[PDB]
């Protein structure tokens, strides 16, 4: 059961540490709160070992693409089983109601399902943190240096792997735990698209998307 190298343990510690420090008419709210968190995400990303080794345009490539996906993780991470909903310190922004008062209520069910599904995995803040990193360093279209990013990503990937192996005594179930986590990367993709589709909808229905998002999530 190969232990976590002092280098990986410092990495886990680092991430778990900064994640805490980045916790948190209708449509008007949402759009603003999202911006706040999207900024917390961008900051968490920039302080991620490896983000620097990467080109400047590739950072924008990653931050732009991972923004919605990691957003989904953040919300999902605050799902309360008892009340079967999202208790995001409830700015009354990410609640069934506001999303209804904001029109986009259809989207609620798809979001909750993901919440229910992710919740059932029972992730550590470590599992969750490594995952957020791994998501950010995924192979996205238009990367000038895919090979590099893949490098950075593999370091987090292997950490997560070793952490799980140690947490389970090299139990066979390790591949299962590790596997389901990488599975989220896939479901996370469909949600991201759905996010894009909504933007495209506001476009042909002329809705107000603060230039911050208008830029980060494109418009063309």
């Amino acid at each position: 059961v190969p232990p976590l190298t002092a280098n990986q343990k410092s990495l886990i510690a680092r991430l778990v540490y900064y994640q805490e420090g980045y916790e948190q008419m209708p449509f008007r709210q949402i759009t603003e709160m999202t911006i706040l968190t999207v900024q917390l995400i961008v900051e968490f990303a920039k302080g991620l070992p490896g983000f620097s080794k990467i080109s400047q345009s590739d950072q924008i490539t990653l931050l732009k693409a991972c923004s919605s996906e990691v957003m989904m993780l953040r919300v999902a991470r605050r799902y309360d089983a008892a009340t079967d909903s999202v208790l995001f310190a409830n700015n009354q922004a990410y609640t069934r109601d506001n999303y209804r008062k904001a029109g986009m209520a259809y989207v609620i069910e798809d979001l909750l399902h993901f919440c229910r599904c992710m919740y059932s995995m029972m992730m550590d803040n470590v599992h969750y943190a490594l995952l957020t990193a791994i998501v950010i360093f995924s192979d996205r279209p238009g990367l000038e240096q895919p090979s590099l990013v893949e490098e950075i990503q593999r370091y987090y990937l292997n950490t997560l792997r070793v952490y799980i192996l140690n947490q389970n005594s090299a139990s066979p179930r390790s591949a299962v735990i590790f596997g389901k986590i990488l599975g989220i990367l896939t479901e996370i993709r469909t949600l991201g698209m759905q996010n894009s589709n909504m933007c495209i909808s506001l476009k042909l229905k002329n809705r107000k998307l603060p230039p911050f998002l208008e830029e980060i999530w494109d418009v063309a």
Partner: protein, 242 residues
Amino acid sequence: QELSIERLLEMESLVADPSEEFQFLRVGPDSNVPPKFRAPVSSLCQIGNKQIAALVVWARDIPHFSQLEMEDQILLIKGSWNELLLFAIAWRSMEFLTSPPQLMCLMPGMTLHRNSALQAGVGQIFDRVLSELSLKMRTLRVDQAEYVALKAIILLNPDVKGLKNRQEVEVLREKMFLCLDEYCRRSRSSEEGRFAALLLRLPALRSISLKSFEHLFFFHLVADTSIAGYIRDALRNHAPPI
């Protein structure tokens, strides 16, 4: 329990019987597909339709799959047929690699040329499929054993919204992870980080798959309204492979 890479590997060899035609894909009434191209487009739909049927028959004989509730057997195939076609296109397309790749193999003795993709306005997706999937799999040097395992994993997706027995679908996908991991450490042994390297193709397969539906739906080629129905009958009536 019986689900294994060795078993999936031999299934891969069986052949679907004279594909009892099901219109999953088709060029229908009032389509934005310019006249001079319906014939071709339609024949490509004809082909996919054939592959889908072969796919529906593959899923059926998968260990314990048919022991699942019928509602789920349907929802599962319903949610993964597209990704499975693309994954198969990409596997099949590796033989034509080596300017970006220019040939995509939709079926044995049949290839799509990048230029046709360009004219079709589907240039990017055509390129993503050949590099993110085909080229990467060649580089990664992924073999048939890993290929079948991944198919099974793509199929057995417990996150599929609507299933009535998620747990049953989970036990099956997890057994697959166990299988894939065992294969990698008892063969590819030396290659560390492989399990994750393989599984990293799945979200790539997903994005591409989603972009596909963007196009198919744009050109009114999908019969979404009737998919479930087609799978239901295919599972029950179709004939078993050889």
